[PDB]
Write a protein that binds this ligand. Structure first.
Ligand SMILES: [Ca+2]
Ligand SMILES: [Ca+2]
Ligand SMILES: [Ca+2]
Ligand SMILES: [Ca+2]
Ligand SMILES: [Ca+2]
Ligand SMILES: [Ca+2]
Ligand SMILES: [Zn+2]
Ligand SMILES: [Zn+2]
Ligand SMILES: [Zn+2]
Ligand SMILES: [Zn+2]
Ligand SMILES: [Zn+2]
Lengths: 397, 398
């Protein structure tokens, strides 16, 4: 059960586990307490499974969206750093770590989407979403394509949708307003309409999957794709002079991408916490800490005001972060799981013809509210299961 | 259909049905009105059934909590005395009898848990939850545990959890906010935590139940125990020089359990109406009306400030009442029938290291809402289902 007098940390194999085992040594040769990392196949389960009963690691590394469901179930011994530490990094990052208003996890890395172009084919990109049609019939004219991305999925579509008005739930002062779902409103209407007005004017496709997004831009076709840092490696593979800058602005309004903060929280039943304190504080952070991580595997835009600043001399990194300033924190609330499906169906109909813009987005918000039910129910089942299992244990006699 | 020109009343077994015979004879002599009392079981089932058809008694006696399901289903007549009558009883007992603000029943008797100790092993008891661990150590030394009581149920474990500010729902303004469930704050946190640490530090095991604990005290093998007025008989039987006192405080804050006011409502149909109040008012709510039941059935405490102050020279009572005054009034709104299942689980889970404190409680709100909404299901489907008969009886019936 737990640790006591040591310190065990979990982070995903894919992320630079090596920086930790380094700050492990930094810690080991400074306070005299042993730190190690573990990268178990999909810890997502492992953690809340045994963390709920005490045990697991003392600390954890993962995207902030999932932390909600952990903090919801009661796992993170909410953190306490002073103004000094809070001020040491970006204010909007702090908005990404609030459940019931309280702090929970320390924010580490930040991923958001950018505009990747082909300089050999395209100069000074656009800067407004309204330029791209005038681009296409100019470039499609020479046998090419203006733009392409994942139109099949919805994580990718929101950037325009939200650009004007359209949001998920409004937070309104450091929480989430469950009622104030801002889809079928001013912004979403003309947001989505634009896209249908593209596909109907042949500029975009519909069948477009993710492969086709990556594959097409990669072969010098479609000099205009939108993706995140995870494909940056697969552009040196192709070797196509790119790329990466701030997204175009629809209706003057900045495009609105989603933001996923890595960050790290602390198991409540982990007797150490104080050791996670000074360790996470001024060992893990402070250039060096992050330096050591993002070296073995880059983290992209990072929480620390000073460090993100230093490697921002990368024209790619900078642009990602600039999309974070004018973006939406991925709400950690479990309501999001629904929003996905409801919006996913709304995009499949939007330009499918099977339905219309206005009517798709209304039926979606109408359906998104109608999903809480499905959850209230899902949870009711999960509750019957936690009484029925006591009955099952009473059944063996 | 009820009565008309009389008064027909139900009560229960452990309720001294003859006690009212004095009150129904004193009523019959002064105004000349016939007053028959019955003692039928399955009252809580056969009453809401008959009072739907306008039948049943003109008046009822039970604890306020069941009255929630009744009041809601419009079964009870709004009862209006006077603010100059309202001061004859304790104003708090009044906070315990109001469905959606409006008054619905006359309060009778108070039931809360009390601290029972043994003057032999401990002549003057602790009184602070926090001291309680050290005592086991003191007593355990000669044998005998400090404390053994029911750890399976939550009515027996909640008093401490609420201690630091934990609560089922929120009162204020004469209503209960169905959303403000306080079983997850620091009060709840420290409450449960503090308890676990008594099992943890082997002051008692989790397998202690109701009979297991009571038997152990009745043989004088634990110094203290906690229970209500249903023991007394059983402890006098054991001839143990005991005593009843106000419960221990945690973090200076006084503990507080759920209370249980016995009360009297009026059938909305009950054509007598005018005869009910008159009866309760002055024929059942003086010293005597209360006296007359006491001789039959000892009702621990009573809400009548006047008559209460009288039996108070009994210490076993003054302690109960003190406990109730400083106590969370048990609610009557349906969701409380859900609260039991949700909280019972959190308790047994932490009492096992099957999950943690913080994990049990924030995940009890899940279980709570889940019932409160499934509760809605059962109720609602029980429309369609029970409407299937009137569907077919009226449709045809061959
Ligand atoms: Ca899929
Ligand atoms: Ca709206
Ligand atoms: Ca596929
Ligand atoms: Ca009449
Ligand atoms: Ca008193
Ligand atoms: Ca049924
Ligand atoms: Zn692995
Ligand atoms: Zn065009
Ligand atoms: Zn440097
Ligand atoms: Zn009987
Ligand atoms: Zn101890």
């Amino acid at each position: 059960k737990i640790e006591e007098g040591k310190l065990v940390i979990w982070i995903n194999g894919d992320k630079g586990y090596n920086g930790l085992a380094e700050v492990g040594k930094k810690f080991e040769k400074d306070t005299g307490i042993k730190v190690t990392v573990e990268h178990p196949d999909k810890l997502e389960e492992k953690f809340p499974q045994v963390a709920a009963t005490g045990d697991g690691p003392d600390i954890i590394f993962w995207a902030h969206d999932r932390f909600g469901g952990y903090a919801q179930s009661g796992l993170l011994a909410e953190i306490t750093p002073d103004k000094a530490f809070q001020d040491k990094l970006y204010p909007f990052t702090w908005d990404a770590v609030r459940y019931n208003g309280k702090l929970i996890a320390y924010p580490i890395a930040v991923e958001a989407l950018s505009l990747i172009y082909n300089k050999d084919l395209l100069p000074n990109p656009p800067k407004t979403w309204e330029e791209i049609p005038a681009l296409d019939k100019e470039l499609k004219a020479k046998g090419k394509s203006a733009l392409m991305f994942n139109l099949q999925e919805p994580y990718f579509t929101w950037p325009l949708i939200a650009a004007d008005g359209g949001y998920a739930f409004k937070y309104e002062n450091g929480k989430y307003d469950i009622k104030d779902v801002g889809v079928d409103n001013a912004g979403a209407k003309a947001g989505l309409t634009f896209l249908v007005d593209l596909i109907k004017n042949k500029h975009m496709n519909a069948d477009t999957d993710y492969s086709i997004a990556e594959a097409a831009f990669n072969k010098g076709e479609t000099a205009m794709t939108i993706n995140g840092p995870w494909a940056w490696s697969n552009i040196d593979t192709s070797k196509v002079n790119y790329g990466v800058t701030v997204l175009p602005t629809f209706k003057g309004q900045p495009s609105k991408p989603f933001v996923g903060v890595l960050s790290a929280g602390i198991n409540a039943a982990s007797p150490n916490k104080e050791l996670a304190k000074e360790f996470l504080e001024n060992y893990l952070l402070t250039d060096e800490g992050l330096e050591a991580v993002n070296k073995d595997k880059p983290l992209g835009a990072v929480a620390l005001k000073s460090y993100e600043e230093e490697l921002a001399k990368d024209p790619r990194i900078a642009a990602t972060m600039e999309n974070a300033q004018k973006g939406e924190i991925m709400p950690n609330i479990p309501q999001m799981s629904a929003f996905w499906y409801a919006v996913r169906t709304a995009v499949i109909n939007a330009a499918s013809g099977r339905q219309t813009v206005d009517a798709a987005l209304a039926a979606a918000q109408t359906n998104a509210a109608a999903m809480a039910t499905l959850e209230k129910l899902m949870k009711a089942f999960e509750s019957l299961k936690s009484f029925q299992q006591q009955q099952q244990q009473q059944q063996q006699q």
